[PDB]
């Protein structure tokens, strides 16, 4: 019995919650020694989950949120649709 990070943070609904869920496991770090943005405790990680959730919170779409962070953090991140 562990938190996950998905555990810290305060949804506006659970429709946002499971919008985060998606895209931090649909978004990946196949590089990193963990590749589960969902998973990992690597600051990056962190830094993902953050911006996320930040950009959910601004009305951001699910497609606006993907080109995001792969345009703005393609050094490590990859989108892997499912």
Same mark, same amino acid.
């Given at each position: &019995?562990?938190?996950?990070? !998905?555990?810290?943070?305060? +949804? ?7 919008? +985060?869920?998606? *895209?931090? /496991?649909? *978004? ?9 943005i969902? %998973?990992?405790?690597? #600051?990056?990680?962190? %830094? *993902?989950?953050? /911006?996320?959730? $930040? /950009? *959910?919170? /601004? $009305?951001?779409? %699910? &497609?606006? !949120?993907? %080109? ?5 953090? $393609?050094? +490590?991140?990859?989108?892997? #649709? #499912?």
């Amino acid at each position: &019995g562990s938190h996950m990070a !998905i555990d810290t943070y305060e +949804f506006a609904s659970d429709a946002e919650r499971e919008r +985060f869920r998606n *895209l931090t /496991q649909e *978004l990946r770090c196949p590089k990193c020694q963990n590749q589960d943005i969902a %998973d990992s405790n690597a #600051p990056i990680a962190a %830094d *993902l989950r953050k /911006q996320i959730y $930040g /950009q *959910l919170q /601004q $009305g951001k779409s %699910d &497609g606006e !949120i993907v %080109d995001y962070m792969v345009a703005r953090y $393609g050094d +490590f991140v990859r989108y892997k #649709p #499912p």
